[model samples]
Target: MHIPEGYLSPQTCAVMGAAMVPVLTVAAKKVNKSFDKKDVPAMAIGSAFAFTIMMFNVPIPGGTTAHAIGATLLATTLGPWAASISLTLALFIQALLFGDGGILALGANSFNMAFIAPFVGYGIYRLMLSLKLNKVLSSAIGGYVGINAAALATAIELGLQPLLFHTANGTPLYFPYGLNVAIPAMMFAHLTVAGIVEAVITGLVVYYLQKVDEENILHKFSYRLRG
Candidate 1:
């Protein structure tokens, strides 16, 4: 979800930005160490996929926007560290260059979509796989839950601004909506349109890859990923 500029307090933005530094650093380092030779090209394609997917975002009923991400799909295949960097890089371009999201709000968006979505989605996928579930179902479940988790985080971040940062005269200096409005609106759109989009993309792509490149790629990294 794209949380617009001025929606969050400057302090909140900075806090979120500071929070991402270590996570992204770890992601960069982990990707460097864990990446296979084929992973380089795979990550490029994954980043490109994530970059384009976010361009199709739509404004939801909430003050924010909703969109599908390749996070779960990429995480399932290339691992969460690679997916994290890929998603973050895509977010950086969208926010800084294209202005699809707020410049100051980039940190918030990256934390929600890049950090939360991939890790949550990948965890769910791994958990499902441990239960002997199929890749398609695991990916679908992961994507569905992952994007929704991001939406929830965005909802809380936006919702709390009013409660936590309002003026003495009862004016909200940041986001105008409280949790009552923000939570419901964000959840509604994600649970329906955006979540379904993510699930379908993740499931179908994993299925296609299974049929075409199981031996070529996924099998090569089968120890690292179940896909």
Candidate 2:
């Protein structure tokens, strides 16, 4: 899902970076409010899990690797900002230390996957819960939305550059793939398989957290997150 350096022109890179600054700033403020001493261990472990999971590449057709974001699970157990910040740190280290994602493109990657997925997923989760759905149903809905959000973000990131930039050959840089092709294909695959995986994982994590130390986690988050 990481775009290499040359795939996006310098103009695209700059635009993405500029767009990310506000999101990053907002995430930073949210993190300051959400962080707790009890959450420290979970944050570290979740970050490590996300980083390691991304390292194991799953081959996709046309020579790309797509991995699960696993952001919904973290966001539900932790908070969206916490998950986002942790993911940002993990991606930064991966790019700087391991040379995984291109340094120039890291902001784009973080904005798409780390920042977008968790908030979108959590929003779906809460919406389903508010609709009087059962926990199992909410879990499934959350996971599906999470994966779809990531995929949509991927497609947008890929499509945006072409719309905004032109090639030296007097052609558009971005090749548009129709919604009929991109949206349904991405959603269907994720809804059936990756969604199930994320649902189960998120359900289990939420259940465990509720079962153990319920008060602390609830009290810490309740006031800040109340609707």
Candidate 3:
């Protein structure tokens, strides 16, 4: 879901960058206030896991690839703010050191993977827990839905470029596809493959962590106002 450099106009990039500023700021503050020294290792682990998983991109249709972000797992375990901070670090490293994502497009990518995914997943998780669902099952549902939500947001951004910006002669300047194409292509891949993988990964990890290191997994309701 990483938008390559030059795929979006400077205006789009700048707008996205501006949008993420508040998100990152709030996330940083929340994480700082919420995490104790004991939670530091989990933060490291979450960032590393997200970084590693994003590297193994599986080819999808339309000359693109898809991968699980591990955002939901982090959110389910560490809280949404912490997950956002962790994923922002991972995305920053990927863009700067590895060039996995575009530097110019980092804001858009981070907005989708770091902010939208974690928050959506965390919301779903809490909702499920409120309904008295099992934690593992709820985590799986959250991960499955969260990754797809990110994919949809990415698809919309990519799809909008062509519709919103083009030459006078109607020559597309960026992200050649419109919503009709981008949405289906991204959603199909995630709904079929990446989403399931994310769900399983989240469920199993939450299960194992709950069994062995329950203290590390933050309770959904107990920390409502904390993070």
Candidate 3 structure quality by residue, lDDT tens digits, 1-227 = 88778888999999989999999999888877775777878888899999998997876554256998889899978888888888998999999998777899989998999999999998999899999999999999999899999999989998898899999989889888888888899999999988999999899888997776456455654656764
Cα lDDT, model 2, residue 89: 79
Instruction: Write model 2 residue lDDT over 54-171, tens digit each, in one string.
Output: 7755543321336666787777767788888778878888889987877888877887778778888888988998999866567557866876677676666665555556677657
What lDDT does candidate 2 reach at residue 11? 69
Q: By TM-score, who's the top model here?
A: 1
Choose 2 or 3, whichever is better by TM-score.
Answer: 3
lDDT of 2: 0.70
Off by over 4 Å in 1: 35-38, 214-227
TM-score of each: 0.91, 0.78, 0.91
For model 1 the local lDDT of residue 55 reads: 80
TM-score-based ranking: 1, 3, 2
Window of ten residues with lowest summed lDDT in model 2: 56-65
Q: Model 3: clashing residue pairs? A: none
lDDT of 3 at 227: 42
